[PDB]
Amino acid sequence: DSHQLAKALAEAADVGAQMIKLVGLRELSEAERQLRSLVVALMQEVFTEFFPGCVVHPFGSSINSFDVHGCDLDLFLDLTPKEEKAEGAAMLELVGSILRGCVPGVYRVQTVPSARRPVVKFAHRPSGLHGDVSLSNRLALHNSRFLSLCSELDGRVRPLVYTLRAWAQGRGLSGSGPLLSNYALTLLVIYFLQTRDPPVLPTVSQLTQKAGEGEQVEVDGWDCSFPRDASRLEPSINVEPLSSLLAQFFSAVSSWDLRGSLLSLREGQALPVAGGLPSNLWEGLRLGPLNLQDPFDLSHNVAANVTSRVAGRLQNCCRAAANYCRSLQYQRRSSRGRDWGLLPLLQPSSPSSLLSATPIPLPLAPFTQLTAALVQVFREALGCHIEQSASWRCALWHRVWQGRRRARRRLQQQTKEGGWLATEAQVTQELKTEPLLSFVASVSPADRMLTVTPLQDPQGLFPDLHHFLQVFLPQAIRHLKLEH
Ligand SMILES: O=c1ccn([C@@H]2O[C@H](COP(=O)(O)OP(=O)(O)OP(=O)(O)O)[C@@H](O)[C@H]2O)c(=O)[nH]1
Ligand SMILES: [Ba+2]
Ligand SMILES: [Cl-]
């Protein structure tokens, strides 16, 4: 791993071979699946001991075909409004005590009622496995099955999802908190496949319409019905190779309008967010920087946790990735030993690149006035020489991002013993023809955020400038807001 993987990808044919080989290397072995099966069997044994006729249904990465080594094990246990929450939480505690004290080998048991879907986190010691026990999740089962079904519908699915998933892990786009879940990212890939001119994957509404007799199922008032086998469905007429689909992915999601669009896997289409339509229809839908609808529960934005910085970082990383995929280093292999194809995409991100990818949130203000105030801050309040979404090229011959404290103290003392822009500009000018550091500033139409990328950085001081800008620019615009 990280060594064997690198040479394995570098050694093999074209890009598609790299993606396929990646899937081959990361996926769970037979022994791993045997181990997981046995552990789930034990859990089943103890839960049967407590709950006669209860079924333990594995879901998520286990059954959705996107599994990798050491992945979580998601288990679903199948057996007034605040009273119902309290009842559910108590029940969850009961399951938690069953895990904690009964089933042999399991430790690290933490009940999490506060989560969206309440869950009991567990670790099984002898197998070295960990995961979540869920009481109510029946939608995850069917949508996981839906994911594996997608994998069966077209052979390019697993390679795309695996590669893009690893890439997202690399670019810091995926994880907990504000980031994207692997499920959300997966839904994005699938939606991308549905939106190709020839469709690579059918829309979920098409699967629902196809369905079958007795294959009808309704969970939590939503229609989860899809065909059980991929044989009853006609293949894709899309001839696009893996690499082209990867590049097209990056370019696509880089060019999309995320804020103003709710991406529907059901209709296989982009539904306009503004104004008010989908949130009025399904009534449970949270809207934000990135909106991606679950194929079954239509009141659930799977990306609803994604902050503007994360969406911005996503589209930036995707634009950069597209730029790379247009280079010859991507398409053509290497003679001897050099990194080609998937390798720079799976390689760790440069600190300057990692920083530049994630934009800087700015206070609310009209685009024109915001831009004017920005270039006014760079020009006036900093030593920046600037020149002509919006963008400006900026040059700094000075250390201006650092040394401001001492200079401000000196000025404070000089003034003591004998309005923001002009004063801070004086602070800057009191800090003191080849450019020391040159960088690009960019503002997107929606949401309005400043993106700072490097150009010429001989001494490698760019990240310091980036952090300093992260602190300085918002408060500058903040003070400029109060002059009106
Ligand atoms: O918003 C969500 C998130 C997750 N889920 C359900 O939870 C399951 C967990 O989906 P994950 O986001 O955990 O991804 P994963 O398990 O496929 O991969 P790893 O995290 O193991 O790397 C998914 O398969 C989905 O069924 C939802 O239904 N909605
Ligand atoms: Ba998981
Ligand atoms: Cl597109």
Residue numbers in the entry: 145 to 223, 329 to 637, 763 to 792, 802 to 815, 826 to 877
Paper text:
After transcription, the 3′-end is oligo-uridylylated by a terminal uridylyltransferase, TUT1 (TUTase6)910, one of the members of the non-canonical nucleotidyltransferases. TUT1 is composed of N-terminal Zn-finger, RRM, palm, fingers and KA-1 domains. The C-terminal region of TUT1 is a previously unidentified RNA-binding domain, and it was named the KA-1 domain.
The form-I and -II crystals belong to the space groups P21212, and P21, respectively. Subsequently, the structure was modelled and refined to an R factor of 24.6% (Rfree of 29.4%), using reflections up to 2.95 Å resolution.
